[PDB]
Every structure is written in structure tokens, then in C-alpha cells.
Amino acid sequence: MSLQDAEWYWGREEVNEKLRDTADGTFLVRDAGDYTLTLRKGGNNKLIKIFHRDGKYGFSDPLTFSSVVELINHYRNESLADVKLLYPVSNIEAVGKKLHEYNTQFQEKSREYDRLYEEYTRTSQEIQMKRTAIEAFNETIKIFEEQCQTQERYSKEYIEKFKREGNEKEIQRIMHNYDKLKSRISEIIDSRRRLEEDLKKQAAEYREIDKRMNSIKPDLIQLRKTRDQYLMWLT
Amino acid sequence: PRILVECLLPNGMIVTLECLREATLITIKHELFKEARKYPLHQLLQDESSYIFVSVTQEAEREEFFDETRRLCDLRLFQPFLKVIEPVGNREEKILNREIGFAIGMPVCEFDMVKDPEVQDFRRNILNVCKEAVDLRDLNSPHSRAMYVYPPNVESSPELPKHIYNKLDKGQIIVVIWVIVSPNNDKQKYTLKINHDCVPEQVIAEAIRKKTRSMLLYQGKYILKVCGCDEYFLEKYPLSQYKYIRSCIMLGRMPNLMLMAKESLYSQLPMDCFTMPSYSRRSTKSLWVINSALRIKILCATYVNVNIRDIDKIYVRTGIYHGGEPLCDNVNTQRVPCSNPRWNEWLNYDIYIPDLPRAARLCLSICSVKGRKGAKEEHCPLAWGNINLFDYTDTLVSGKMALNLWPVPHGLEDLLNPIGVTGSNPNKETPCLELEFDWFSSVVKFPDMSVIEEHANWSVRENDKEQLKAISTRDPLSEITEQEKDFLWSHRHYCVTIPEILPKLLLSVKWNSRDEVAQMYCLVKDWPPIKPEQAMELLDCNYPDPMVRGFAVRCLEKYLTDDKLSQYLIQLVQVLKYEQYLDNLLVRFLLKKALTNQRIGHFFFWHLKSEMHNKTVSQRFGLLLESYCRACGMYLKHLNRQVEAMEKLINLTDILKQEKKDETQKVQMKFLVEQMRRPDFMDALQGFLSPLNPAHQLGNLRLEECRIMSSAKRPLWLNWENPDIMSELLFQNNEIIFKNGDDLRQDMLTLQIIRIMENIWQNQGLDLRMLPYGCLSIGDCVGLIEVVRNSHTIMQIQCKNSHTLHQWLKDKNKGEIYDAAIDLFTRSCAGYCVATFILGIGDRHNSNIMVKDDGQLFHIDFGHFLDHKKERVPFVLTQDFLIVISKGAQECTKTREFERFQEMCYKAYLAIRQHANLFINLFSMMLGSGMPELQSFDDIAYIRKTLALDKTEQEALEYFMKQMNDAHHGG
Ligand SMILES: CCN1CCN(c2ccc(Nc3cc(Nc4cccc5c4N(C(C)=O)CC5)ccn3)cc2)CC1
């Protein structure tokens, strides 16, 4: 039969894209006679070169089969053994206006995605810094708690009220430091809580930044196909 | 100034110490104990020199400043508080750990925290390699330690290309020996004419014979140094095999050497002490017996960041992979609403379990669905994650598992990412995904090697012989048809005679089988060796089998010389990421090479540190950096000097980048001068080894000539002195450009490729000279660029008509030097014409091409190294270039100068086109590096097109001729 106009024929990136996530048994014939057939089997796109010699086409010698379309039809009728060749892959002013509009839409989508990506990376930076600061605050609070425990263990034994030595040191000095020390520990705990709250808020905002990111992609890749098909017409 | 630090004495009382910002810890401790007397309970407190400080820094690490003399500025303490406690740990271990943590960038305590058995085993087992390397270094001290510290910078083969050989004066070179042996440095220069095959020992013997008036009869007492830089000829190599010597031969310069006493450097070498750290102290059925199709259960994805309205449903794509090629078709889980991401489905795969290859993997991806568009309902992968089917100890993963799915990379159109990290995302806010595997009532392990070599060995004209060679000579990035695979596997046994066919026969094996893989193992066991440039192919994602990569590493060890290893090092470091496990032969080889040679080790460390900011390869590179720094020796003290130094610059640029980015360069320059006059900046920047070349030492900054460029990014034009005594010989000033925000891995790759091109052309006999200057990326968007001096941009020369450049070249070389000034100009012009045509470097205006006063011409900036701006001759020869090449005329295009120029261009192009496999490998092994313009296989398809690999030699030459005629308007 005639060639240059068929569903299977297409005359490597395009072949891979077309056969990507395609069903088993698919076959696409294209030139790379060369007449290379890309057949999808085992989840991978096998290649078979159609040998053309002595005015005869064939996968392997002898080239008994006559024409490439004849080969495609025959191996669509029967399996290649081991897989049958199942279903294959196959005005000017208006097209110009559509191309311009989809170009503008693609630029808008790209700018929006870039802005979302930059915001995502930035918020990730602040999230990491805030988490590190919170861990440092935890460590500082632990050290202060150990210091307070040691101070409370030591003060009573070392110098309680006037009995041992408490004339005015415990009231003026001994208990002054214990209360003075407790002032910073409580404030340090206060700073951790305040910063911890901010981290949760950023996580939600960082969470939301992902919501806009995981919806634009479906609406932008499909934009490429419309742009790709309309832009790659020029006829 | 006074910062009002807080002190927590062992009693508990808090003391406020008004201490200056630039104060040491000893004085602070003394003042604190002096004030503690006024405080109560001062009875319990002991003497000052009996307690140690503890604090928390900005890295959330609790550390004890044992005796660190660094002021509280360098402490980086998170809060101005300091507890006092009696020291418990070893001073040596803590100090070394602090230095390692500063060099690496992440505190070493984190690795101790990590509970992963594989991580702990790697940490305790890389110490074996570290110890053997350290033992080898100290085998023949102090000579061996000297060779480690100052390695011989030599070439790959003693034999010289004929052109440079004829450049010599009948095999005799005229060197100059400088001797400073006297009460004061007098620089006694002796001109000595000696062969180019004499070892440095004979050079020194004949120098002694001269120096001594006219004869003497020193021996085994002196060594040779390169004047003006720290490179020593300590090895028994011919005097012309050293890179400096051969560079002087080629460039027509007198080699100015120096005679230095051996004891001088032997005493200058501090002793390296490597101490094993603390962590070094701490029912099986053959997998082939199990007979059942692999089954894996998906339970639930607890966390998913999806939009209910925009996403109808979600599902988990899965696949069983080997490299990047599925072993069986992907299975899928039934769609479910995004709100309730629970599946609880036992996916069943087509792969019979015993037929699992060792390098097998399971790639999962949680992805949404959107059928609104119509027939082709677009699918977007929300997250991905890989899982090795075998543990580091050859065990099938069993039981339940929880995997944090990494975010999908930008531009990853596909659903499954089978090349990424095979591990859980460290971040715990990531979308988890729970999995379960089958339980076989026992532990299943890959069968032992002997078991495999029994299956195979029990389960087994020129018409075709030309086809095998035609295939082998083909590109590794080309296409192989099923007839070719079946043909190769049919003649697997005969392929041994063609040892360079393994990179292809490997693709001809069905990893889905057991007999085929067993026979492939029995073949790779007895394979004749291959070249290192061909064994770098077997070290890519394509070839993840344990034994294939073990064989490739054996070839690299046997045949890869240090000169090559220092060039194909970026690629090996990058390929480190794509390795299955943490403890593998490649890392052992690279670590031993980095520990037995500081020249390789310096760049090894810097490449690892640069790549250790992407969280994907943060942990592996941190473990490796720790293992290196533990046995790095004394070089740590130098590396830190560089590290902090770069920091002191980075911050500065940032302050100028946005804070003061309001006024013109006048205020920026004033602020830069003010910040450089500060004692901290002055003390940090001066006095350290240059990261670009450890030989060069940078002395006092010349703040007079340090300015901020007019370039768009506004880099730093840093000027330094040369502390070396003989600085006048090489260069009295050392200049560098510090660029913040511009990726410099593209420039590094282009310069490495240009260096390889120059080496190829030197070997071929085409003396094309290029400037592949130095360039390092010290992080992300931060880098150092060498500055070539005495060279003016083509715009400046013209600015200072179509004859301006030629007039300037004539002026700078008045006399007989005109012949050389024109020949070198034309040769360099041809070299860059070919090189920037093949690599498609960005289009060139005047500013990107600059010429030395001598005549050489080089391109400076890069960043379009595969024509990623949507062939495209960038270096179209301007009128001025052709006028200079033809020596000045109006009928330029019709002179013998054109004929010679085009002949050299064609020769270079064909020489490169005969070595396309190397460049394809170099570009493909760094696809994942993340460069803005090397990200898809179309980028390397551009290289394949420019080299015209598909066509034939005559077709390729005609294609290049047509491209030239199109570019320079015919000729
Ligand atoms: C007929 C020949 N076929 C089969 C062999 N095939 C192949 C060639 C080279 C490599 N090496 C490699 C692969 C890497 N990942 C990538 C693999 C594939 C695509 C992309 C990768 N990207 C990353 C990680 O960013 C960008 C997009 C990274 C480093 N090196 C792997 C496979 C080419 C097609």
C-alpha cells in the first residue's frame, strides 16, 4: 500500500514522548532503508531495524516481504514472534491568533511557576533556620534546667538560713541568685514558645505554597501541548 | 565591645561579665573566677585552671571550649551564656572533632546521632582504608610524607610530541638554577644546559659541578623547587616529564629552578598523627530457592499536600528497575480520593523473585489525576522515592517500611524518577508512604558468588567479526536495536577478543533472567582489561551491577594515572552519588587516592564540600568528608584557613549585594575599603593557600587594587601579594575574582573539556594553545575565577577601525617577534573556533575575547556550553581577526594564511571527532549535577550533532566546511 500517509508512520525525543506510558503492543515506524520500528514491550521501547536490500524489506534475512506497509500489515495480523502489533500511534489568521494567545498563556504560567518556586525555596530556607534555632533553644533550656537543679540541690545544704549561715546572705544573696536565675530560664522558655509558634505558621504558609505548586503543573504542561501542536504547524 | 555575657558557675549563681567582643576565653575565665569570690558559696568553687566552659552554638550543638584561644567572636555561640563544668572528654578528640566540623560545615555529632546500621558500619569501616593510607604515607618517612605533601606534578608519559621535541635545542634545555646558600639571600643564578631525559638527581649533580667554580668532583642533600611557587621535584622522573618543565618547553621560557636543602622541607613537614576515633570501638536461605512472584503491599500515605478540587484522585506508580530500565512493567494502585490516602493493596509484579538482579530497585511515586482536559488526563507526580530490594549485606528488604518521599524535581515530566537517591527524605514534614514486603519465614540473601558461577558453567568469519567492531566503535549514547542485542549476546564468548565491547555487551544481557546474568558474571570475571577512559563508562547509572562496577574500579586502579585522576575527578566525585550503597569499591579507591596525595585530596575535599549543600547528597558526602578529615593529616589547618577565608568574603558580598545595593559603585567601593580595613577581615583573608592552586600562597592584600567590577554580577577583584622569596620570577602579585550568585560548574566543565581538547591536539601534533584557566565552585552560586594578567579585552584594544587590533599587535611586538605573535594568534584562533563550534559556547562579542600582549587570544566567560538558548556559530571570525591572521591586507580571504588556518581547523575538528566517546561520557556523567543548561539528553545530542557522529568522516568534514562558510561569509 501507499506510504507517507499512515497512522503508524511518522517520518527520537518525539518517539519517546509518544510511547511514554503507552500500552503493551504499541508500534510506531519512523526513519532513522532504515524504517526503524519502535515497539513497546516489557515497559520499554524496543527498536527493530527494517532491513531494505535487493529491493526487499525484512526484519531478518531473507527480505522476503515486499513493502514496509506490507510488513506493518502482516505483523499487525499476527504476533511478531512474542507480541502482536496492537493499536498503533498516529485558518492561518485563526491559527496565528491561537498561537499568540497560547504563547502569552505559556509565559504567564512560566512566570507564576517561577514565582511559586522561588517562594517555596525561600520559605524552605527560613523553615530550616527556624528549626535550627528552636533546637538551639531546646539545648539552652536544658542547660539552664540542669543549672537550676544543681543550684537548688546545693543552696540548702551549703548555706541555709542563719542556722548554718543565713544572717542576710540567703535573703539578699542566696535567694537573690535563685530568683534571678529563674528569671532568665522562664524568659528563655518564653522565646522558644514564641519562635515555635512562628515555625508552625510558616509551615502552614509553606504548606499553602505547595498547594499552588501542585496544581499549576497540570495546567501548564497541557499548555505546552496546545502551544507545541499549534506552534509546530506553521502552515 | 562589652556584650554582657552570662556565666553559670558550678554552684549555680549567674554572673554578668562585661567582656569585650574581641576577647579570649582565658581572660574571660580568669575574670569570671575573680568575680565569683564576691558571689556566695565561693567555697565549692575550685581554682581557675580546674574547670572548662560549655555552651551552645548556632548549630544547636553543645560544645566545650577546652582552651580555644579564638575570641568570643569566633565562638559563634548561640546565646551569650557559658556554663562551667569539670572536663570529662579527651581534649584531643574534642579539638579534632571541632576542626572537622568547621571544615565539613556540619557538626560531627550528627553522624553519631544517626542510628542507621549502614551509616554506622560505613563510619567504622572506612577507617580501614584511612589506616592503610596513613600507614603507606609513613612507610618511608620523611621522604614519603614529603611526597604526600608536595606530590610530583608530572605528565602521563615520558615520550614527547615531536613538535615540542623539535622546539628543544637538539634535546637540550637551558635551565637556570638559583642557589641562595649564603649568610644573606644573594640569588646565585647558574645557567645549565642539560638533556630533557635527565632525572633531577643528575640535574643537581651537574649544578654542583658548575656552582663550584668550574668543577668539584650536594648529592643526596638538596632538592629542586619551582621558583615563585611551592612545587618540588622530589621524584625520579625525567626533567621534562614535570608539568612545569614541559610547559616551559612549549611556551619557550627558561625554567628558573631553585636548589633547596632537603632538611629545610623535612623540618618544615609537621608530623601527622591519625588516631582512631571513639566510634571505631563499637537461618539464611539462598534467594534462588524462593519461588514466588515479587509482591509488595502499599498501606497508606499519611501526609499529602494536594488540593481536593484541583486533584480528583491519587495513586502510587511503582516499578522494579535496574539502572534506568524497568525489569517489568509498572504496576499501579487503584485511584482513591485525596482526602483519604489509604490503599492497603498488595501490588503483584511480573518478575519471578529469583530473577531479581542485585542492583534491582523499587521506584515509587505518589501522583494525582486530572481528567478534565479530556482523553489525555494529565498526570503530575506529587512525590517520589526509591528503595533498594537488597540491603548492604545482600538481604531482601522484609517487613514494613516508612519512606519519606522527596519532592519531585523541576522539569521531571515523567512519573517515576528511577535515578534519584535510594533513601527516605531526612525532612520529617515530607509526605510519608508506608510499605510492606513479603516474609519468607527466613532471611533471604543473594546467592554467594561460587553459587552463581555453577549455574552458568552448567546452564549453558569476517562477515560478522566486522559488525562487532562497528558496534564497539559506536557511541555509548547511540541506539541499539534488538537484532544487535541478540547478535552481541549470541557472540558473547567471542567478544572477549574485542575487550572494548563490554560497555555494549552489557546492554545485550537480560537482567530479568538468572542464566543470562550468571553467564555475564562468569564472563566479567575473566575479561581482558580496558582503558580507563572506557572504564569510566562502566561507572555510570547505566551499569549498577556490583561486579561490573568492581571490574571497572579494578581497571581504574590498575591503569588510571594520577595526572588523569586529577582531571577526570569532577566526574568521579559526581558519580559517587549514583552508587547503590555507602561502602563500595569506588569510594575506597577515591579515598585512598585522596589520602595518598594532597594535590588530589585538596580538590577532592573542595568538590565534596561544594556538592554537600544539596540535601540529597548531604549525608553521604558528610560521612566521606569526615572520613577524609580524620586522616587528612595536618592539611586540615590549611583547609580551615581557606574555608573561613571564603566565608569572610561571602558575607561581605551579601552586604553589598542587597543591603547597600542602592548607590553607584563609589559608595560600594568606600564600604568595601572600610570593611577590609577592619582587623577581622584583614587577618582572615591574608596568609593562606589559594583554593584554585594549593601551590600559590596569598600574602597581604593589596587593598589599593581591590575594586568591585563593572560586571552585572559585580564580583570582587581581589589582589594579593606573593609571600615566596623568589616571587619576582613567576609573578609578584596574585589576582582572583570572587563571584557571588553565578553558577561556576558550567565554566568548570567547559574549561575541563578545553583542557582535554588541548591535550588531544598536543598528542596529535597540532600545537593549538588555549587558556583553560582555573575556576572553582566553593558552594552554590559562589566561586573563584583566576585572572589572567597582561591581557586586554578585544573591546579595550579596539577602543584604545578594522585595523586597530592589528596595529596594536604590531606595536606590542615590533621587530622579529611579529612572526611568532601572528603564528600563536592564528593557532589559538583556530583552536577556539573548533572548540566553541563543537561545544556551542554562547555567542561572542568583543568583551568575551581578550588577547595577551604576546598575541594569544582567549575567551573568558562561559555559561552557554551546549547552546541551550532554544549550529549557531558563536565565534564567527570578525574582520579584524582575519586581517590579523592574514598579516594585513584587503584581499585577505585569498591568501595562504587562510589555507593554513583552515587546514589546522579541519585537522583539529577531525581529531576531536575521533574522540567523541570521551566528551559524551564527560557530559553524561554530569547530567544530575543540576547545571542550568546541562539537564536533558538534547544537550548532549547537540554535541553528537556538532561532531556529526552519525555521518561519515567525509560527510562530517563537509558539514564543518559548510558551517564555516555560512559563519564567516564564505572562504
Ligand atoms: C539508547 C540510550 N538510552 C539508554 C541509555 N541512556 C543513559 C545515558 C547516560 C546515563 N548516565 C547518567 C544519567 C543521569 N540521570 C538521567 C538519566 C536520564 C535522563 C535524565 C537524567 N537527568 C538527571 C538525573 O538530572 C536529566 C534527565 C545522570 C548522570 N548520568 C544514563 C542513561 C541514554 C538513552
Residues of B in contact with A184 (CB under 8 A): 6, 14
**Cα four-point dihedral sign B585, B590, B593, B595:** negative
Q: Which atom of ligand 1 is nearest to the CA of B420?
A: 24
Say yes or no for a CB contact (<8 Å) between A177 and B13.
Answer: yes
Q: Rounded CA gap, A112 and A107, in Å?
A: 9
Contact by Cβ (8 Å): B776, B602: no
Strand partners, A36: A30, A49
Q: Rounded CA gap, B701 and B721, in Å?
A: 7
Those residues with Cβ within 8 angstroms of residue B733's Cβ, 6 or more apart along the chain or in another chain:
B702, B705, B719, B720, B721, B722, B789
Say yes or no for a CB contact (<8 Å) between A214 and B78.
Answer: no
Query: DSSP string covering B212-224, please?
Result: STT----TTTEEE
Residues A96, A73 within the same domain? no
Residues A136, A43 within the same domain? no
Q: What is the signed CA dihedral for A63, A68, A72, A78, rounded to 10 degrees?
A: -20
Residue B62, SS3 per DSSP = strand
CA of B927 to the centre of ligand 1 (A): 7
Mutation for testing the A interface, residue in B4, B11, B313, B658 having most A CBs under 10 Å: B11
Rg (CA), chain B: 32
- Residue A5 in any domain: the answer is no
Ligand 1 near B614 CB (within 6 A) = no
Ligand 1 near B324 CB (within 6 A) = yes
Residues of B in contact with A20 (CB under 8 A): 414
Read off the C-alpha cell for B69.
584561644
At CA B31, angle to CA B29 and CA B34, rounded to 5?
110
Q: What is the signed CA dihedral for B689, B691, B693, B697, rounded to 10 degrees?
A: -20
Query: CB pairs below 8 Å between A and B: how many?
Result: 136
Last residue of a domain, one of A45, A77, A109: A77
Contact by Cβ (8 Å): B854, B819: no
> Does an H or E element contain B651, and which?
helix B635-654
Q: How many CB atoms lie within 10 A of CB A17?
A: 12
| Shortest CA distance from B487: residue in chain A | A60
What type of residue is B94?
K
Residues A188, A211 within the same domain? yes
Say yes or no for a CB contact (<8 Å) between B482 and A36.
Answer: no
Q: What are phi and psi of B698, to 5 degrees?
A: -100, 125
Ligand 1 near B936 CB (within 6 A) = yes
Protein residue whose Cα sits closest to atom 8 of ligand 1: B477
Q: Which of A43, A60, A158 sits opposite B326 (nearest CB)?
A: A43
Experimental technique for the deposited model: cryo-EM
Read off the C-alpha cell for B171.
634535546
Strand partners, A77: none
Q: Rounded CA gap, A83 and A88, in Å?
A: 13
| Shortest CA distance from A226: residue in chain B | B373
Q: Rounded CA gap, B237 and B241, in Å?
A: 6
Q: What are phi and psi of A37, to 5 degrees?
A: -105, 125
- Residue A135 in any domain: the answer is yes
Q: How many CB atoms lie within 10 A of CB B488?
A: 23
Kindly give the pairing relationship between strand B443-445 and strand B284-286.
parallel
Residues A47, A96 within the same domain? no
For cell 499548555, name the residue. A223
Residues A54, A112 within the same domain? no
Whole-angstrom CA distances from B824 to B117, B704, B902 are: 60, 34, 15
Read off the C-alpha cell for B555.
581497571
Q: How many CB atoms lie within 10 A of CB B504?
A: 22
Ligand 1 near B539 CB (within 6 A) = no
Q: Rounded CA gap, B561 and B547, in Å?
A: 22
Ligand 1 near B784 CB (within 6 A) = no
Mutation for testing the B interface, residue in A217, A223, A227 having most B CBs under 10 Å: A217
Protein residue whose Cα sits closest to atom 4 of ligand 1: B477
Residues A214, A183 within the same domain? yes
Q: Rounded CA gap, B504 and A1, in Å?
A: 37
Ligand 1 near B412 CB (within 6 A) = no
Say yes or no for a CB contact (<8 Å) between A143 and B329.
Answer: no
Q: Rounded CA gap, B353 and A4, in Å?
A: 46
Contact by Cβ (8 Å): B302, B432: yes
Q: What are phi and psi of B891, to 5 degrees?
A: -105, 40
For cell 504476533, name the residue. A79
* Residue A179 belongs to domain spanning: 92-231
- Residue A4 in any domain: the answer is no
Read off the C-alpha cell for B312.
480528583
- Residue A129 in any domain: the answer is yes
Secondary structure letter of residue B383 according to DSSP: E
Query: DSSP string covering A47-103, please?
Result: EEE-EEETTEEESSSS-----HHHHHHHHHHSB----B--S----HHHHHHHHHHHH
Strand partners, B15: B7
Query: DSSP string covering B593-629, please?
Result: HHHS-HHHHHHHHHHHHHHTTSGGGHHHHHHHHHHHH
- Residue A120 in any domain: the answer is yes
Read off the C-alpha cell for B608.
565534596
Say yes or no for a CB contact (<8 Å) between A158 and B43.
Answer: yes
Contact by Cβ (8 Å): B119, B623: yes
Say yes or no for a CB contact (<8 Å) between B479 and A32.
Answer: yes
Residue B564, SS3 per DSSP = helix
Ligand 1 near B417 CB (within 6 A) = no
Q: Rounded CA gap, A84 and A231, in Å?
A: 35
Query: DSSP string covering B790-803, please?
Result: SEEEHHHHHH--TT
**Cα four-point dihedral sign B415, B419, B420, B421:** positive
- Residue A128 in any domain: the answer is yes
Residues A57, A172 within the same domain? no
Q: Rounded CA gap, B26 and B51, in Å?
A: 11
Q: Which of B419, B921, B934 to mutate to test the pocket of ligand 1 (most atoms within 8 A of CB)?
A: B419
Contact by Cβ (8 Å): A71, A57: yes
For cell 561571602, name the residue. B650
Secondary structure letter of residue B655 according to DSSP: I
Q: Rounded CA gap, B826 and B564, in Å?
A: 29
CA of B155 to the centre of ligand 1 (A): 32
Residue B114, SS3 per DSSP = coil
In terms of residues, how long is chain B? Answer: 971
Smallest Cα–Cα separation from B12: which of A30, A155, A6?
A155
Say yes or no for a CB contact (<8 Å) between B307 and A174.
Answer: no
| Shortest CA distance from B328: residue in chain A | A42
Residues A185, A70 within the same domain? no
Residues of B in contact with A217 (CB under 8 A): 380
Ligand 1 near B928 CB (within 6 A) = yes
Q: B427 to chain A nearest CA, in Å?
A: 10
Q: Which of A48, A207, A214 sits opposite B481 (nearest CB)?
A: A48
Those residues with Cβ within 8 angstroms of residue B372's Cβ, 6 or more apart along the chain or in another chain:
none
Q: Rounded CA gap, B790 and B856, in Å?
A: 11
Contact by Cβ (8 Å): B326, A43: yes
Q: What are phi and psi of A129, to 5 degrees?
A: -60, -45
Q: Looking at residue A115, which CATH number applies to its domain?
A: 1.10.287.1490
> Does an H or E element contain B102, and which?
helix B91-104
Q: What is the signed CA dihedral for A145, A146, A150, A155, rounded to 10 degrees?
A: -20
Contact by Cβ (8 Å): B177, B259: yes
Say yes or no for a CB contact (<8 Å) between B12 and A24.
Answer: no
Q: Which domains does chain B have, with CATH numbers?
A: 1-90 (3.10.20.90), 91-268 (3.10.20.90), 283-441 (2.60.40.150), 442-632 (1.25.40.70), 633-789 (3.30.1010.10), 790-971 (1.10.1070.11)
Q: How many CB atoms lie within 10 A of CB B372?
A: 11
For cell 581572660, name the residue. B27
Smallest Cα–Cα separation from A210: which of B414, B302, B431, B415?
B431
Contact by Cβ (8 Å): B422, B361: yes
Residues A66, A163 within the same domain? no
At CA B615, angle to CA B611 and CA B620, rounded to 5?
65
Read off the C-alpha cell for B733.
602579585
Contact by Cβ (8 Å): B103, B640: yes
Task: Write b or e for each residue in B45-81: b if 16 or more Cβ atoms lie within 10 A of its Cβ, otherwise e.
Answer: beeeeebbbbbbbebbbbbbbbebeebbebbebbbbb
Q: Rounded CA gap, B565 and B575, in Å?
A: 14
Protein residue whose Cα sits closest to atom 30 of ligand 1: B925
A81 touches chain B (CB under 8 A): no
Q: Rounded CA gap, B546 and B581, in Å?
A: 10
Q: A197 to chain B nearest CA, in Å?
A: 16
Say yes or no for a CB contact (<8 Å) between B12 and A117.
Answer: no
Q: What is the signed CA dihedral for B580, B583, B588, B589, rounded to 10 degrees?
A: -20
Q: Which of B937, B944, B950 to mutate to test the pocket of ligand 1 (most atoms within 8 A of CB)?
A: B937
- Residue A192 in any domain: the answer is yes
Residue B300, SS3 per DSSP = strand
| Shortest CA distance from A117: residue in chain B | B410
Q: Which of A13, A184, A214 sits opposite B382 (nearest CB)?
A: A214
Residues A105, A68 within the same domain? no
Say yes or no for a CB contact (<8 Å) between B8 and A147.
Answer: yes
Resolution, in Å, please? 3.2
Q: Which of A154, A169, A217 sits opposite B12 (nearest CB)?
A: A154
User: How many independent structural domains does chain A possess?
Assistant: 2
Residues A128, A207 within the same domain? yes
Burial of B218 (0-12, 13-18, 19+ CB in 10 A): middle
Q: Rounded CA gap, B920 and B935, in Å?
A: 14
CA of B324 to the centre of ligand 1 (A): 8
Mutation for testing the A interface, residue in B13, B361, B406, B542 having most A CBs under 10 Å: B13
Q: Up-side HSE of residue B348: CA atoms within 13 Å toward CB? A: 2
Q: B484 to chain A nearest CA, in Å?
A: 9
**Cα four-point dihedral sign A133, A136, A141, A147:** negative
Q: Rounded CA gap, B959 and B971, in Å?
A: 14
**Cα four-point dihedral sign B352, B356, B362, B363:** negative
Segments of B323-395 assigned E as strands: 325-331, 336-337, 342-352, 361-369, 381-388
Residues A35, A103 within the same domain? no
Q: A165 to chain B nearest CA, in Å?
A: 11
Read off the C-alpha cell for B641.
584557613
Contact by Cβ (8 Å): B746, B762: no
Query: DSSP string covering chain A, please?
Result: ---SS-SSB---HHHHHHHTTPPTT-EEEE-----EEEEEETTEEEEEE-EEETTEEESSSS-----HHHHHHHHHHSB----B--S----HHHHHHHHHHHHHHHHHHHHHHHHHHHHHHHHHHHHHHHHHHHHHHHHHHHHHHHHHHHHHHHHHHHS-TTTTS-SSHIIIIIHHHHHHHHHHHHHHHHHHHHHHHHHHHHHHHHHHHHHHHHHHHHHHHHHHHHHHHHHTT--
CA of B411 to the centre of ligand 1 (A): 14
Q: What are phi and psi of B901, to 5 degrees?
A: -60, -50
- Residue A166 in any domain: the answer is yes
Say yes or no for a CB contact (<8 Å) between A117 and B410.
Answer: yes
Residues of B in contact with A42 (CB under 8 A): 326, 328-329, 512
Read off the C-alpha cell for B964.
564555516
Q: Looking at residue A69, which CATH number applies to its domain?
A: 3.30.505.10
Contact by Cβ (8 Å): B723, B695: no
Secondary structure letter of residue B279 according to DSSP: G
Q: A212 to chain B nearest CA, in Å?
A: 8
Contact by Cβ (8 Å): B30, B44: no
Q: What are phi and psi of A124, to 5 degrees?
A: -65, -40
